[PDB]
Write a protein that binds this ligand. Structure first.
Ligand SMILES: NCCCC[C@H](N[C@@H](CCc1ccccc1)C(=O)O)C(=O)N1CCC[C@H]1C(=O)O
Ligand SMILES: [Cl-]
Ligand SMILES: [Cl-]
Ligand SMILES: [Zn+2]
Length: 574
């Protein structure tokens, strides 16, 4: 029986590599050239890989995992018993695949037009408007328009999507899709753990929220900002107000200390998307980590195509399951924000390369959060004033607070948003939220967690969640909340391993081999062991903890309390 098991695993692995490699190809061609032809081929490739999944999934279920001795074989087989979408009857499977395809296409090709004929795409057009406009009505036009065109257009597909993905989940042993997704963490206390983590960052977020609200009151007027209420969702410099980095100019703690125009600097000295990824590649190798293969530069799409073809711009990293072909798909824009994204994506590629020799079923991060944290960890060091100056993009207490504020506008502001997304989806999946209350419950959470309000009252027909990539693309979001917490835990440990002393925010792990070694040993484990082990390998302890992030921002927290206190700010939104 045990002999049949290891043989099954071997056959599953060698056959999966081939089928998954072929699927990755068709999926890539569609993402990089949305045509009715590539669509048709992809949907056909869907059925083929589903066929393979059903064949081996059916076999795997015949094994009594409880009686399997080898833990690795036991772990792989248990995982293969989950057919995911392939568990759906043929009819439902094709409908589900088409549903997903249509939602993704609808989102990626949506445009917002003016009365003339000027239509803007999300990236970089609408994104730039949200980041640079300081006119309430212009920001509103883009904010509302995007939701009218992308959000509303997804609503017709969602209820069916929810029904089918939940059905698939039940056919695989779970109670609903949310249950299935949370299982990726293999942590029964997950919901409580995440709740405790969120609560620990509340003091910091609430103080940042009040400070920013005051600055907005200063700029947009008392008639448009309630000093004791939520902040209008279109004023944070980002379409989803998930990161507030772009309004740094409106909230700079010490304006007497001017900061260079980072974007102007990159452009001023000919930085290109390729340069950007080359710098990221250099940081990884400096740590002793792996460089991306030559093939990466030849097959990746680092720029928005200008040959008439429509593509999915939303940045992503791809593993073609042959241990050789890895690629990034990003309509890269030359600015600091995308430089961080490039590192984020390169972090995924590094993970792909580190565990490429493990059985395919175990080729994943310790948990989804780990996969998301890698690139961000390095980017933390890249973002330091001193590091940016070494790249010639930049030229002290007050400077520390200014830097910490810039970092907080990104990292701290994101905490409540990254927490909120799946709190909403989990309740949609378990049936607590019906299509009648999709939007209203989304905004109840936007208010409760982020303290934001819609600048325009929502009406029947609106489906704002659909205006956020991950929703129509069906990509879990809690991984980002986990990532933002643990990436600071990783930064703290790697900095200590690198011999750094003094304030954590001043640490730059560039070219530290000790740091790189901890990340490598952890990444090599892939999904072979419970994530707490990878956590231990990197940090010396096994739990998730907000301590590192709180320690990183401690100076800012103190500055924020003193500043908000002297202005008599009322934290929160009664
Ligand atoms: N200026 C846009 C940059 C996007 C980069 C990043 N991309 C995503 C992609 C997710 C994906 C999974 C499977 C298939 C297709 C896509 C990523 O995690 O790399 C992302 O979404 N991130 C990175 C952090 C948070 C989250 C976001 O922006 O909400
Ligand atoms: Cl929204
Ligand atoms: Cl996740
Ligand atoms: Zn990612």
């Amino acid at each position: 029986d045990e002999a049949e098991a290891s043989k099954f695993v071997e056959e599953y692995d060698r056959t999966s590599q081939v089928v998954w490699n072929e699927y990755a190809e068709a999926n890539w061609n569609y993402n990089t050239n949305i045509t009715t032809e590539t669509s048709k081929i992809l949907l056909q490739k869907n059925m083929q890989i589903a066929n393979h999944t059903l064949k081996y999934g059916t076999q795997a279920r015949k094994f009594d995992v409880n009686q399997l001795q080898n833990t690795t074989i036991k772990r792989i087989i248990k995982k293969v018993q989950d057919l995911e979408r392939a568990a759906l009857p043929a009819q439902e499977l094709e409908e589900y695949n088409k549903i997903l395809l249509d939602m993704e296409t609808t989102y990626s090709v949506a445009t917002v037009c003016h009365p003339n004929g000027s239509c803007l795409q999300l990236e970089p057009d609408l994104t730039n408007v949200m980041a640079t406009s300081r006119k309430y009505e212009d920001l509103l036009w883009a904010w509302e328009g995007w939701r009218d065109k992308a959000g509303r257009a997804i609503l017709q597909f969602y209820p069916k999507y929810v029904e089918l993905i939940n059905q698939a989940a039940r056919l695989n042993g779970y109670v609903d899709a949310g249950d299935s997704w949370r299982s990726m963490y293999e942590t029964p206390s997950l919901e409580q753990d995440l709740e405790r983590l969120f609560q620990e960052l509340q003091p910091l977020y609430l103080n940042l929220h009040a400070y920013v609200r005051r600055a907005l009151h200063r700029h947009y007027g008392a008639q448009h900002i309630n000093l004791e209420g939520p902040i209008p969702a279109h004023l944070l410099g980002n379409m989803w107000a998930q990161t507030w980095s772009n309004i740094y100019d409106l909230v700079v703690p010490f304006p007497s200390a001017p900061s260079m125009d980072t974007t102007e600097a990159m452009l001023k000295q000919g930085w290109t998307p390729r340069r950007m990824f080359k710098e990221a590649d250099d940081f990884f190798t400096s740590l002793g980590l792996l460089p991306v293969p030559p093939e990466f530069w030849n097959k990746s799409m680092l720029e928005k195509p200008t040959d008439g073809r429509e593509v999915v711009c939303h940045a992503s990293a791809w593993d073609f399951y042959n241990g050789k072909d890895f690629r990034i798909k990003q309509c890269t824009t030359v600015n600091l924000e995308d430089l961080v994204v490039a590192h984020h994506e390169m972090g995924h590629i590094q993970y792909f390369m580190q565990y490429k020799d493990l059985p395919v079923a175990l080729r994943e991060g310790a948990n989804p959060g780990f996969h998301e944290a890698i690139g961000d960890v390095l980017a933390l060091s890249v973002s330091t004033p001193k590091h940016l100056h070494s790249l010639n993009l930049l030229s002290s207490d007050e400077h520390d607070i200014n830097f910490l504020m810039k970092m907080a506008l990104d990292k701290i502001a994101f905490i409540p948003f990254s927490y909120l997304v799946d709190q909403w989806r989990w309740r949609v999946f378990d049936g607590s939220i019906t299509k009648e209350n999709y939007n209203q419950e989304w905004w109840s959470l936007r208010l409760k967690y982020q303290g934001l309000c819609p600048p325009v009252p929502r009406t029947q027909g609106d489906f704002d969640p659909g205006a956020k990539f991950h929703i129509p693309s069906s990509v879990p979001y809690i991984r980002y909340f986990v990532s933002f917490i643990i990436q600071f835990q990783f930064h703290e440990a790697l900095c200590q391993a690198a011999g750094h002393t003094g304030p954590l925010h001043k640490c730059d792990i560039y070219q530290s081999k000790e740091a790189g070694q901890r990340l490598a040993t952890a990444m090599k484990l892939g999904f072979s062991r419970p994530w707490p082990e990878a956590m231990q390998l990197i940090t010396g302890q096994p739990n998730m903890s907000a301590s590192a992030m709180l320690s990183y921002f401690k100076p800012l927290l103190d500055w924020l309390r003193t500043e908000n206190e002297l202005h008599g700010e009322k934290l929160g939104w009664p």
